[PDB]
């Protein structure tokens, strides 16, 4: 009981000395010993209780690091933070270790590089790199934080719920920023899935969970969450764009793609152009999947009309011009298609599909050796392609002779052998 008395005596001594024109480091030292004796008394009383709450002891403990980090004493401040964390937790220090752990995680994440850190025991489970200890801190904090939740009652009071939601949002924000940079998405997705309990009508967690799911490989769950995101806030057009892009991917769902395309089109120019492009691609694929006669031409004319509209709406998109030229070439109209791909290649001349289509058009025009040359520097720029190899083999067999075709076949067999086990 006398220890807290002398601790408050040191606090009052510092409060009086602040009015006298380095004694500040002496006040800091008395603050450190006051904190040490307060922690020792807490340990003794928590041992005794098997066989209260002051006011200024925490001030004396905290103003030391406040001065540390307001005067630039970053090294001593982080060292004292670490030593305070080294104290064994009791039933009265959980919020203090909350706050100090959160601040330490922030300052370590946004304060210095990797080559300016050493182990807690040494002085410049045992962590070896800063993000490891930050991750451990985040796990422990969230693990023994998840039991003070409010679970969205809102009978009459809201403020405590708002504070709890803020704390959850910030802790998961640090978790996301820590784990995203290192390219680990599975554990992040599971973390957000576990966290999903709190939210009831909040856009942020739904958006982040959908993004994490779509960036991890799973698609259908991402599509459903993205649909609910459509339901929540009908202002953004990028979210239906992502849903449509996933729909026509490996999933091979086509009706939903046209639904989302119609939704985004029926809402600036740079977005409705993308919507028209997606609608045209969906129509072209549906045409390719047809089974009777007339509907193929109907969908082809629809697709070329949409592609023309998209091309007109934006003059500096090489993808739109390339796909319009491809659709034109599907319809056997050569000169306009070759002119269009010429314009697209003028827009950008480092592509692969553009050169491949140019070579294909040249071959369809019966100019074999020029297309052969084009394929030659196409392979020169991309020495590890596969489709270009098949096209070159076909062209060589069509023009010169089987010898070079066999040579290329053996070369590509060797390439596959090298690239795989």
């Amino acid at each position: 009981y006398r220890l807290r008395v002398i601790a408050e005596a040191y606090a009052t001594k510092g409060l009086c000395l602040e009015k006298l024109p380095d004694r500040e480091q002496d006040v800091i030292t008395c603050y450190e010993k006051a904190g040490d004796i307060a922690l020792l008394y807490l340990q003794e009383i928590e041992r005794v209780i098997l066989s209260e709450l002051g006011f200024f002891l925490e001030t004396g403990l905290q103003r030391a690091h406040v001065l540390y980090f307001k005067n630039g004493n970053l090294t001593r401040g982080v060292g004292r933070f670490r030593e305070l964390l080294r104290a064994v937790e009791t039933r009265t220090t959980q919020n203090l270790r909350m706050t100090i752990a959160r601040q330490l995680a922030e300052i370590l994440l946004r304060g210095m590089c990797e080559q300016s850190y050493w182990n807690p025991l040494e002085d410049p489970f045992c962590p070896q790199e800063n993000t490891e200890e930050a991750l451990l801190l985040l796990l422990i904090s969230e693990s023994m934080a998840n039991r003070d939740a409010v679970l969205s009652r809102i009978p009459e009071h809201k403020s405590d719920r708002l504070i709890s939601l803020q704390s959850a949002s910030v802790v998961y924000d640090l978790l996301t920023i820590a784990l995203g940079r290192r390219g680990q998405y599975e554990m992040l997705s599971e973390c957000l899935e576990r966290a999903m309990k709190f939210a009831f009508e909040e856009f942020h967690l739904w958006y982040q969970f959908a993004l994490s799911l779509m960036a991890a490989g799973k698609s259908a769950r991402a599509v459903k969450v993205l649909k609910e995101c459509i339901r929540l806030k009908p202002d953004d057009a990028t979210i239906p764009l992502l849903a449509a892009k996933l729909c026509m991917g490996s999933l091979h769902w086509l009706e939903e793609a046209e639904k989302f395309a119609k939704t985004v089109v029926d809402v600036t120019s740079e977005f409705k152009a993308k919507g028209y492009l997606a609608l045209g691609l969906t129509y072209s694929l549906q045409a390719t999947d047809a089974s009777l006669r007339g509907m193929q031409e109907v969908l082809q004319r629809k697709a070329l009309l949409a592609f023309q509209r998209a091309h007109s709406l934006s003059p500096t998109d090489h993808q739109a011009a390339f796909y319009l030229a491809l659709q034109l070439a599907i319809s056997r109209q050569i000169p306009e298609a070759l002119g269009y791909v010429r314009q697209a290649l003028q827009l950008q001349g480092d592509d692969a599909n553009s050169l491949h289509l140019l070579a294909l058009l040249l071959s369809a025009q019966k100019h074999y050796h020029d297309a052969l040359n084009i394929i030659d520097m196409a392979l020169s720029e991309y020495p590890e392609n596969f489709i270009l190899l098949f096209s070159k083999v076909k062209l060589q067999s069509l023009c010169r002779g089987p010898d070079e075709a066999l040579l290329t076949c053996k070369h590509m067999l060797q390439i596959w052998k090298s690239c795989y086990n």
Binding site: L135, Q208, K245, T316
Partner: protein, 254 residues
Amino acid sequence: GVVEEWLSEFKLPNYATKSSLVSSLYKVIQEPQSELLEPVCHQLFEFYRSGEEQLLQFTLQFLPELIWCYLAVSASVHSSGCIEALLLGVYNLEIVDKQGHTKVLSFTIPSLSKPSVYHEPSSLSKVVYSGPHPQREMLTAQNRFEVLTFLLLCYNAALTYMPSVSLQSLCQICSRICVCGYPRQHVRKYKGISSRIPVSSGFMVQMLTGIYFAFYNGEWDLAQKALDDIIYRAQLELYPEPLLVANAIKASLP
């Protein structure tokens, strides 16, 4: 020049430990009309050969400026054709030369069922995030961005020792590169060559790391606008992870 005659008379870290070189060297790379540009380039290579730490630490900060200038102008009028060799040599030296082996950067995630220095379980797998990177011989349009992100990560590893001018320049490049060939440039009124550079997702993530670190060193408006262009371009190009990281950064501000 000052550095020119310094080299002329020149032809243990206390050799320069100089407060007048860095600004002049930065102004040298500004204009493309330099007669000694490639000689001072391989002279910088010669400095990088010196394993002594301060020279490499205080000369690595020049990489973003040249990466913009001579990999966007030559790779759009004039082709110097040797700085790429310097970059390739630096890449090979970094990836290969540590003690005679290739790096495998790795760390292990923590757990909660095992006692730690701060907690107890009463009341573990190794993961790899980089390497191996086999050496290269020419900057092709199929592998140049991988080495670009590797160089960016290597420069990231030591952001502590670079000055504020380097941070300002890095933010300027990180802003102007991703909006150069898009209409938003006329909002920013940035001139030069109107073209689009096909960046990747990892490149965006690695610049976002540096942008986040620089956000808390006084630079506020430039980093804010750079984040704006980054998120705009990511939304345009439909790249999930950079958009997620940008949203996380944005939703964590005072």
